[PDB]
TrEMBL record, chain E:
Involved in the biosynthesis of antibiotic erythromycin via the biosynthesis of its aglycone precursor, 6-deoxyerythronolide B (6-dEB). This is 6-deoxyerythronolide-B synthase. The chain holds residues 745 to 840 of 4735 of the full protein. It comes from Amycolatopsis mediterranei. The gene is rifA. Homodimer. Erythronolide synthase is composed of EryAI, EryAII and EryAIII multimodular (2 modules) polypeptides each coding for a functional synthase subunit which participates in 2 of the six FAS-like elongation steps required for formation of the polyketide. Module 1, 2, 3, 4, 5, and 6 participating in biosynthesis steps 1, 2, 3, 4, 5, and 6, respectively. The lineage of its organism: Bacteria, Bacillati, Actinomycetota, Actinomycetes, Pseudonocardiales.
Length: 209, 205, 626, 49, 96, 209, 205, 48
């Protein structure tokens, strides 16, 4: 009964060439009056979401004319003729035949496109004065890799690890990942190796203290 | 020109109450329906509830997970919408937006940040992060609340600076790290506003 | 009384979207509608008198650099000097010239020879080329009088007739030297009512004029417009002045982008084109030669000198033109570079083209320069180049470039997918559109860029050949009639449809005083009669009298052929027979078919009456009346 | 489900008028905007400067 | 470095059309050229907008202004200058 | 509770000048959702009707932009910036709040403004062939009178007369009337005048048989 | 391109039936509603009927004055609207239009004239009305049906002609009075194609 | 101050090469007034 919509998870693209993103439904959105109920929303990084397309075809004012939309029935498509750098963000395709709406869905993120890059795996020793307090934070730094999705694991280990990924780099368009694993001093000295699996790297990489 | 302003947000201790207000200008507020949408930090955005207009009776609807504590009202005398935050918890920590329209959210406000915590101000703990051979830096842990200002060589060193975004700990503190990558005068100056803490650190092999 | 809204709101507000989307389409169509080219004309050094002549000259890699003219009154012996640094001399003796510059037809335009003598050659060339361009488009110039079409022309002063003036020739000196009169004379002799502006912007004038014309067509000021440029030298002062600058190659040939380039060479010429909005062109049933998409123009700005160029300005104008045309840098396939041949301009132009066009290219692009074939045509340069590109689109062949041995080493040719054009290439239709770019940078600083696209594809319509067809040719003088007859005979020697040419000659052409007609059934008989034609008459009309004769003009089987080919005569004969049917005991149609007896006078007299009536009716059908 | 369709239709298709009227104003101002004068200079016979 | 445009209306008058002293050569062409009238202004000021010189007898200046207005509507420039200038160098107009 | 709307009956207009037509009502047409329910229709002579304005202040496509509409509550106004020759016709201000609509109302006429003129009243005797037919159709004619509103009555009568009016002249812009009293010749033989009233007439002029 | 064509007119006798057809093209006919309207000669306009679309039940509605006699049908497969004139009277002689849309009359057809009159064809009778004093005319009457072409001097006399339109009379036949005003060679030609009668008369003192 | 409209046209076929025609001037006045979007009764001063 609850309708569902889907779209490609990601679509990297460089400026200059057109791009297309589809949205497929599990039911026919066409109504008896002869309308489709499809909306498109864009969220820039760190800004409030804004409306681009409603009812599938016509475009709201203020939105640049390079955007366009089409489709009908259960399949709809958004097209951009000239991809631009500022067009990065998250796109959501929504229905309005069934109300109220609960969630916006996973959405589709768009990022700039470049060559495949392998992260520079590094591991650093914790400072002495931090150890004297009774704490130890170990970091498996991954530097200058593309695209996202670089998985990491701790071996010597989870439940006390927090992962932070920087935004897309301004110049080289790559990313850096830091998985901070926190432990007490006693636990850190109790044992005397962070596995990395990313599509940029060819083989698993293990780096210990 | 259609203008929306939001107010009433801030840091609130768990278990208390709060009020959020949105003021509209440039259009007939008495003919629209208001909606509230929240976004969890580093997550997706969720629906909260909405309120209709006077023409259709001015009824309201809320989500199931947030029913029983929240009430939304409107005042057409000065065109202001109020939301009553009740029993704020750590999970309800999210950025809130007020949107015009029932189903067509064609205008969004700037949004307000709501923080719920049980900790007090505390200076950061800054530590060196020395290499073993090209990268290096300084690790800052256990500071609350946001933000912390980390600079390299008083702004002299900028290339290769990677100030990884902070993440809240399970105890209520913020942890982050700055890593600069220069192979083969590396000053990491750390400053904290809420505790007025100034820390100077140097790293060498 | 407020619930009856659910259906009405939907019915009302569907119309809102449907209606007000048209306005959104209209803003785009008013901002960026493409322009169509429906006619061109030009003349250039080397005997070129038509675009086909230019294509023929270019296709066989033939240059046209010639010697100095001797009929203009110059002093050849003192001016020509191989020594570079003698006072008041030029160290070159070559160039491109129009040896028929002074020729003009004064009688055609109703201008006395005394006026024609004082007229500047540019005015005469502009008049002739404008008439030729209008004729090429298939529009009657006479019927064009009284409308709101506009003219735009590019020319500069040359000091023609700057010496003493005799009183006999005095009278039209001021009106024959001015610049506004260049468009004034065209608007006068053609009776137009649109704007008439002459723009002088150094060597990039012509395209600028074209640009202006396009804007007018988008504003609704005019429906038809024609734009062009002209340049003919009257004094050799430019040669001496640029010889003192050591900017002219001793050979007089411009080796564009070659490793041995050392100078430029001046030339002359004139070109004119006619422009139309695409929708209006479709509505009026014209034929589309090519489509101009977008254009841009800016200024060099603060540079290393008053005449030195700047690469950044050229890059900016290229980006502006591409943005206005709504295309991408990877869509074009060939660019007509300026190619002046200087030791400084070519590296900068090549670097700019590398910077803007030579990026992310899946297939390398080509470039050429007409100046290597003709020279620097100055104010008439860019239009000429445009014409070349149009022909390249119609013949589906990339023309080659002359006078190249190795690419210039001052630039890095590996920085982008761009390479020279030294051999002919095939350019066939392949589904994707074909586009071209034209550039021109002036001495003063202004720059221009144009984007051209192939005409939309159309399907042909088959027609059946008529058995016998007339061929009517009209002109203003007997010698012009003879020339027209000779040209038509030359055309018919090929493989063309007689019905096609007859229809084009009767519909897409004007009517004049001197007239001559022939009747043909086959191409060979047509050309034989046309060559043998020696009779014509410029009579003066009077009043027509329809004399009806008596008797003695009968023979059985009169109209059997006419009833079999003439529909109006057949229907009139049948109607008359039906009218006379009740009081007769025969069939008049069969009587005239060959199934009647002359002895039956009661059939004889009505037969003559009916044939006379039908002959009057067919005369009425053609449009003549008594 | 689809019973409260009047409100949906009204608020959906009010935006169409609201923004495409601005589009109509845009075309009107594109084809007929006034142009202001901000500075002049002249030199004419009679000592005028 | 901006994109302001210039449009001017003027006609040639044959200043210094006679014999020229030998040391003055190399400057007459740019001295008397019509396009240089606006090109020199744009080069001295450093502008980058379109530069056009028109000539339509006694109604040149107004025409120029009209053109400028149209350009201002098309977004080709931010601001523009428009005007005209006449300076008689020979009495030929009086006698004719 | 049926809403009734009225407008001025006739308004001559000179070309090149703005014109305005008002439309009142017996009840406010504003609805709860916030839309006025009014439409403006134009009917050119010898032509099918045409839509001009819907929902008070919205102009349909194809219509020249010189038309405009405004108003609210119970009163609305149609305004035209400059009037041309083609704007001659009939205008209707028709509501849509209450359905069905029985009729379009009387409307408003538009013509070319001209000075006041008087007619030259003529009366013509019946033809004797018509007497042989056996009827008495007596005709009196008025030529070149402006404006409309001329009235004709019979006194030697009701139910035995008929009138004809020509359409406004392309140049003279006046009007002509031809009134005919119809009876039987038998009644004519027993008793051997069309009273005329017009605003162009200072006094009522009546011509006898 | 949006277009629609009406057909099925003519002259009919009282008592029997007739049908009018409208064919639409250039748009989705299955969505819009169709209505029929009628204009009497020398009168205004009044609504006749309409038919709803499929999505709203495909019902019909007819004018109260003429209810119970007319039927409106639709063919979405061929996109044609049919109106069934039943038991016509003399009052039904008028011009009928078909219009897209139920409430908002958006697009209109070319119309179709329908005449209902029990009278039969009859040749025209021309009586020349002679002056008794600067005008002269030919009163034509008893011609059926329309039209009749009346000219002065076979078109030679043009100025001063006031061709008053024909008016139906209580007798059921048509009559008109065409005159020309000339102060101080005068023939009127009357052609009635339905009766195929051509008669030329004169007006002289 | 502000501009409202402009119009440029050519005299065309006239009595002579330099002779003027009143109809062309009327047409250009009407075109300029229409482009401005005003009426002839709005302006109150003109420089011939």
């Amino acid at each position: 009964d609850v309708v569902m919509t889907q779209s490609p998870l990601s679509l990297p693209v460089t400026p200059g060439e057109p791009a297309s993103i589809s949205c497929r439904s599990s039911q026919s959105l066409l109504h008896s009056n002869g309308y489709n109920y499809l909306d498109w929303y864009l969220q820039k990084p760190g800004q409030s979401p804004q409306l681009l397309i409603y009812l599938g075809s016509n475009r709201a004012s203020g939105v640049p004319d390079r955007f366009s939309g089409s489709g009908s029935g259960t399949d709809f498509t958004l097209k951009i003729s000239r991809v631009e750098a500022e067009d990065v963000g998250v796109y959501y395709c929504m229905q309005s035949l069934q109300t109220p709406r609960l969630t916006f869905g996973p959405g589709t993120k768009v990022d700039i496109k470049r060559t495949v890059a392998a992260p520079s795996v590094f591991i650093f020793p914790p400072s002495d004065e931090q150890l004297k307090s009774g704490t130890a934070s170990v970091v498996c730094l991954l530097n200058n890799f593309y695209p996202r999705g670089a998985k990491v694991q701790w071996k010597v280990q989870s439940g006390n690890s927090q992962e932070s990924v920087t935004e897309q780099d301004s110049k080289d368009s790559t990313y850096s990942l830091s998985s901070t694993l926190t432990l007490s001093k006693a636990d850190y000295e109790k044992h005397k190796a962070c596995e990395v699996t990313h599509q940029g790297l060819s083989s698993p990489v293990t780096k210990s203290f | 020109e259609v203008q929306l302003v939001q107010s009433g947000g801030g840091l609130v201790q768990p278990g208390r109450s709060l009020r959020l207000s949105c003021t509209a200008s440039g259009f007939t507020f008495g003919d629209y329906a208001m909606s509230w949408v929240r976004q969890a930090p580093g997550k997706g955005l969720e629906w909260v509830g909405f309120i209709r207009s006077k023409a259709y009776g001015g009824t309201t609807e809320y989500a199931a997970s947030v029913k029983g504590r929240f009430t939304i009202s409107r005042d057409d005398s000065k065109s202001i919408a109020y939301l009553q935050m009740n029993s704020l918890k750590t999970e309800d920590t999210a950025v809130y937006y007020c949107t015009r329209g029932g189903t067509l959210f064609d205008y969004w406000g700037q949004g307000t940040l709501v923080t719920v915590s049980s900790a007090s101000t505390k200076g950061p703990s800054v530590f060196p992060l020395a290499p073993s051979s090209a990268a290096l830096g300084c690790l800052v842990k256990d500071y609350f609340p946001e933000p912390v200002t980390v600079s390299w060589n008083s702004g002299a060193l900028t290339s290769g600076v990677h100030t990884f975004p902070a993440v809240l700990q399970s105890s209520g503190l913020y942890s982050l790290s700055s890593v600069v990558t220069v192979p083969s005068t590396y000053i990491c100056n750390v400053n904290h506003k809420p505790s007025n803490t100034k820390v100077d650190k140097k790293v060498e092999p | 009384m407020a619930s009856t809204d659910s259906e009405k709101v939907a019915e009302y507000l569907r119309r809102a979207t449907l209606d007000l989307r048209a306005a959104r389409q209209r803003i785009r169509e008013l901002e960026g509608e493409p322009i169509a080219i429906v006619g061109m004309a030009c003349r250039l050094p080397g005997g070129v008198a038509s675009p086909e002549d230019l294509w023929r000259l270019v296709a066989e890699r033939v240059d046209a650099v010639s010697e100095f003219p001797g009929d203009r009154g110059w002093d050849l012996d003192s001016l020509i000097d191989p020594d570079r640094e003698r006072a008041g001399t030029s160290y070159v003796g070559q160039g491109g010239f129009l040896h028929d510059a002074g020729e003009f037809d004064a009688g055609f335009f109703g201008i006395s020879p005394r006026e024609a003598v004082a007229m500047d050659p540019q005015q005469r060339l502009l008049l002739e080329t404008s008439w030729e361009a209008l004729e090429n488009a298939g529009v009657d110039p006479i019927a064009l009088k009284g409308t709101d079409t506009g003219v735009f022309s590019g020319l500069m002063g040359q000091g023609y007739g700057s010496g003493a003036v005799a009183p006999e020739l005095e009278g039209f000196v001021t009106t024959g030297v001015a610049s506004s009169v260049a468009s004034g004379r065209v608007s006068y002799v053609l009776g137009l009512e649109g704007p008439a502006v002459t723009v002088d912007t150094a060597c990039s004038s012509s395209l600028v004029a074209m640009h202006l014309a396009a804007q007018a067509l988008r504003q609704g000021e005019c429906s038809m417009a024609l734009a062009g440029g002209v340049t003919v030298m009257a004094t050799p002062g430019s040669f001496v002045e640029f010889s003192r600058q050591r900017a002219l190659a001793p050979d007089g040939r411009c080796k564009a982008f070659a490793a041995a380039a050392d100078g430029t060479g001046w030339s002359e010429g004139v070109g004119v084109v006619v422009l139309e909005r695409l929708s209006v062109a479709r509505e009026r049933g014209h034929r589309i030669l090519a489509v101009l998409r977008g254009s841009a123009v800016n200024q060099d700005g603060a540079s290393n000198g008053l005449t030195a160029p700047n690469g950044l300005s050229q890059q900016r104008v290229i980006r502006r033109a591409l943005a206005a045309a709504g295309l991408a840098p990877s869509d074009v396939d060939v660019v007509e570079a300026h190619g002046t041949g200087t030791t400084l301009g070519d590296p900068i132009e090549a670097q700019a083209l590398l910077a803007t066009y030579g990026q992310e290219r899946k297939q390398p692009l080509w470039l050429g320069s007409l100046k290597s074939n003709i020279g620097h045509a100055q104010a008439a340069a860019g239009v000429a180049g445009v014409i070349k590109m149009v022909q390249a689109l119609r013949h589906e062949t990339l023309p080659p470039t002359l006078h190249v041995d190795k690419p210039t080493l001052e630039v890095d040719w590996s920085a982008g997918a761009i390479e020279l054009l030294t051999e002919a290439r095939a350019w066939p239709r392949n589904g994707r559109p074909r586009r071209a770019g034209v550039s021109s940078f002036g001495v003063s600083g202004t720059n221009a860029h144009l984007i051209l696209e192939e005409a939309p594809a159309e399907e042909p319509v088959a027609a059946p050949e008529l058995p016998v067809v007339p061929l009517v040719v009209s002109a203003r003088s007997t010698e012009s009639l003879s020339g027209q007859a000779e040209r038509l005979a030359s055309l018919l020697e090929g493989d063309v449809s007689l019905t096609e040419v007859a229809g084009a000659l009767v519909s897409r052409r004007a009517v004049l005083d001197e007239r001559a007609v022939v009747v043909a059934g086959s191409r060979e008989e047509a050309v034989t009669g046309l060559r043998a034609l020696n009779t014509a008459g410029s009579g003066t009309p009077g009043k027509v009298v329809w004399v009806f004769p008596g008797q003695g003009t009968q023979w059985a089987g009169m109209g059997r052929e006419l009833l079999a080919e003439s529909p109006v005569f057949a229907e009139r004969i049948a109607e008359c027979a039906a009218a006379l049917a009740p009081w007769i005991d025969w069939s008049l149609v069969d009587v005239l078919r060959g199934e009647g007896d002359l002895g039956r006078v009661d059939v004889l007299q009505p037969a003559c009456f009916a044939v006379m009536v039908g002959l009057a009716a067919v005369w009425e059908s053609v449009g003549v009346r008594p």
